[PDB]
Structures are given as structure tokens and as C-alpha cells.
């Protein structure tokens, strides 16, 4: 009773939205390296027995429509739901290719009262996107709530930029996949994410010719409203 039931016939869907190229009019830069993240995530969640669906370069309208449609599927035979968003962002917002989408709008589709086949099951939103423009300079060493059973695994602290390497992928996603590969058969998900926090915090530091952006650090943030422990086995 302390752990979510994860032996339904299917582990569940893993929806990966990978936004790399943005409409010129938005002025948003292309996100080099994001394809490496999307491929890593696809393989990682495949190995965890999720039904993975990759979507690329979605407009704000397409993001909302996809989320709505997925929330209206019958998830009765599924243990959980995973959504991964890879894009530009700011506080409370993820970008479609042509403009912003409110994160609250997306997640609301899956509220305990609005997606009944996911009520009581873990709904995980994994987000690689900026949450603002701060840089971390570091320091040298009956009923249930409708908001219950959500977890947001955010790549960076509220208010901060999030870092992505154009060759290797994002610091957060490369770390998340590595920790899942190593520990999904051994550790509870919060402990896996804590190891991701440590990996991102200790092993990465930005390199830039621009002093403003050089030698900067990142800490992801786990936002949990889960009510049980989550094991992938």
C-alpha cells in the first residue's frame, strides 16, 4: 500500500514532445542537441516498457490538441503516464514552435477529476526548458485531491535558465537517462531523481567565450505531489 500499483497490463504512455525548430517570427533559436535527448529518452523509456510516442516541432495548437486527445484515451489498463517536454520556456510556460503554452493548461487535462482512468496513478511530467533568465554562478567546494499524484521533474530551479549542449544533449536529460538506465531496477524514483540532481550539480559547468555565460551551474528541481513510492519494476 506504500507503493503505486505498477503491474497493470501496460506501464503506460510516454509522450515525448521535441521542439527543435521555431517559427522565424518568434525569434526563438534552434535547439541543437535536442534530438540526442529525444533519442535517449525514447530508448530509456522503451527499456522501462513504456509505449513511447515521439512528436517533433509541434505548434502551440498541436501541443494542446495532442494533450487533450491523450487525456481522453482509456488508460484503465495502464499503470502510469509520462510526458516529456523539450523546448524553450519561461516561468510556467513551454513553447510551441509558434508561441507559448501554459503548463497548467496541459497538466489540467490529467487532473484526477478530468482523466478518470488515471485517477490514483502517477502522472509524471519531465521538462527540459528554461524557467527564467537567472544564472547560477555556483560556489567552490472518500475523495483524493485533483492535484494529487503529479510529479514534475524540472531540469532547473525556478527562475533559472536550463543548459543544453549542442553535441551531447541537455545536462538534465543526459543525466536522467543515465540514472534511469543504472538504477531503475534498484531505486525508488525520488532517489533516482536525487541522483540526477547530484549528477547535474556536480559534473556539469558551462563553458563560454562570453563571461556572462561562462562557468555557470545548474540544479534540477523535483516537485512532487505523489502519494506513494514509484518503482519501475
Amino acid at each position: 500500500d506504500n507503493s503505486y500499483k505498477m503491474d497493470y497490463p501496460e506501464m503506460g504512455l510516454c509522450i515525448i514532445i521535441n521542439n527543435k525548430n521555431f517559427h522565424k517570427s518568434t525569434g526563438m533559436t534552434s535547439r541543437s542537441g535536442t534530438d540526442v535527448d529525444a533519442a535517449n529518452l525514447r530508448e530509456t523509456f522503451r527499456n522501462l516498457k513504456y509505449e513511447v510516442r515521439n512528436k517533433n516541432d509541434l505548434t502551440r495548437e498541436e501541443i494542446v490538441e495532442l494533450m487533450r486527445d491523450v487525456s481522453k484515451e482509456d488508460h484503465s489498463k495502464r499503470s502510469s503516464f509520462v510526458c516529456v517536454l523539450l523546448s524553450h520556456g519561461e516561468a510556467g510556460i513551454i513553447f510551441g514552435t509558434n508561441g507559448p503554452v501554459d503548463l497548467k493548461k496541459i497538466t489540467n487535462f490529467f487532473r484526477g477529476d478530468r482523466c478518470r482512468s488515471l485517477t490514483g496513478k502517477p502522472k509524471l511530467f519531465i521538462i527540459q526548458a528554461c524557467r527564467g533568465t537567472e544564472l547560477d554562478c555556483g560556489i567552490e567546494t472518500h475523495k483524493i485531491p485533483v492535484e494529487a499524484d503529479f510529479l514534475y521533474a524540472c531540469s532547473t530551479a525556478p527562475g533559472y535558465y536550463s543548459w543544453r549542449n549542442s553535441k551531447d544533449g541537455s545536462w538534465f536529460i543526459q543525466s536522467l537517462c543515465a540514472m534511469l538506465k543504472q538504477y531503475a531496477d534498484k531505486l525508488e524514483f525520488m532517489h533516482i531523481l536525487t541522483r540526477v540532481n547530484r549528477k547535474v550539480a556536480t559534473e556539469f559547468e558551462s563553458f563560454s567565450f562570453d563571461a556572462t555565460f561562462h562557468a555557470k551551474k545548474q540544479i534540477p528541481c523535483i516537485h512532487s505531489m505523489l502519494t506513494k513510492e514509484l518503482y519501475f519494476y
Partner: peptide
């Protein structure tokens, strides 16, 4: 290294 780039920011999102």
C-alpha cells in the same frame, strides 16, 4: 553549451 547553450541556454533554452
Amino acid at each position: 553549451d547553450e541556454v533554452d
